[PDB]
Design a protein around this nucleic acid. Structure first.
Ligand code: K
Length: 324
DNA sequence: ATTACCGGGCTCTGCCATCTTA
DNA sequence: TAAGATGGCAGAGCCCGGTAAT
């Protein structure tokens, strides 16, 4: 009865809430008051509170005791209340989609038990919160799958493969095993690719590749291949290029292309580009802004050493001065 | 005094489908 | 027997600078 009124004064988007979790609105008891007070208690602005509820209405079904206990467990990993407010604003669902604090506590035990440091649990919680709402078994699955995948390739102690990858790729424990398998076999196939090459690739520069959704990797590589072929680069060169800079698989196809095109419209050859893959770190805006500045001076770009295009502001700005 | 090499810092939700659970 | 709990999916970059090399 009193439910819609409170939410309305709270700033909530009621129509949106009802669409996401209609069920919640057919309960006779809801604790929307205690939650407001609870988050207010921990420093959340009223606008955040509304935003959290607008996106995860079920949040209002939790009791002060539960909320307080879950919060204190997060504070076993994160150090300030503010850190947690921020995470919840960014992703409500991770905190509120479960109310099994025992399970949560077991995740924390398990993850410690795998040999991860607190800075590593902190990193996980901060950037991949939803890790801690996983079932214990689900986190166990992924960990067992990595160990198995560690030894299924030539790794000396899998225990440490797990730590390296989980540190380099914080988002791995919120991916399905299905998905991460398919991304590994995608790399193994498309490129050489013997166990050791593969292993560094996964731990180092191609670590983010394991998070790509189904076939989005395959599809984004296809585009790379076409667009580079079209410009006169051979498959070898395409492979060499992408392996020396796998980040390029994460770009939206359209971005890659526009990026390639903005560079080349200025008479920078496809050759300069793939022998200096990092120029592609820069957003298109930055590239575009820098291109303007240099051609504005006496630079011809056709023959310049274009590495500066992806230098830091400092080093770039310094060098631009010197050119004029 | 200048650039290359390379790794690190940031960084991941919001939706739907299929169970459990009471 | 309807909600709650849980799993899984699509979508996706940019920047900085230490230190080696010259
Ligand atoms: K109920």
């Amino acid at each position: 009865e009193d439910l819609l009124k409170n939410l309305l004064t709270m700033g909530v988007d009621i129509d949106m809430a009802r669409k996401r979790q209609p069920g919640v609105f057919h309960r006779m008891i809801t604790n929307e008051q205690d939650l407001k007070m609870f988050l207010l208690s921990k420093g959340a602005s009223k606008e955040v509170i509304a935003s959290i509820i607008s996106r995860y209405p079920r949040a209002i079904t939790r009791t002060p005791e539960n909320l307080s206990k879950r919060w204190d467990l997060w504070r076993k990993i994160v150090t300030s209340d503010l850190e947690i407010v921020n995470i919840l604003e960014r992703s409500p669902e991770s905190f509120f989609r479960s109310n099994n604090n025992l399970n949560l506590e077991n995740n924390i035990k398990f993850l410690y038990s795998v040999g991860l440091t607190r800075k590593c649990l902190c990193r996980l919680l901060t950037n991949a919160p939803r890790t801690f709402s996983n079932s214990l078994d689900l986190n166990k699955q992924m960990v067992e799958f990595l160990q198995a995948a560690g030894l299924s390739l030539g790794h000396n102690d899998p225990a440490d493969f797990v730590r390296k990858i989980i540190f380099k790729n914080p988002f791995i424990l919120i991916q399905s095993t299905k998905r991460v398998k398919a991304n590994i076999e995608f790399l193994r196939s498309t490129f050489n690719l013997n166990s050791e090459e593969l292993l560094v690739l996964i731990c180092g520069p191609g670590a983010e590749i394991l998070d790509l959704s189904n076939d989005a990797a395959r599809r984004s590589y296809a585009n790379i291949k076409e667009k580079l072929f079209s410009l006169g680069c051979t498959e070898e060169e395409v492979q060499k290029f992408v392996l020396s800079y796998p980040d390029v698989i994460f770009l939206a196809e359209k971005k890659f292309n526009d990026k390639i095109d903005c560079l080349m419209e200025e008479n920078i050859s496809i050759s300069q580009i793939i022998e200096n893959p990092r120029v592609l770190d820069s957003s298109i805006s930055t590239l575009k802004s820098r291109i303007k500045e240099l051609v504005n001076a006496g630079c011809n770009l056709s023959t310049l050493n274009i590495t500066l295009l992806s230098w830091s502001k400092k080093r770039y700005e310094a060098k631009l001065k010197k050119l004029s």
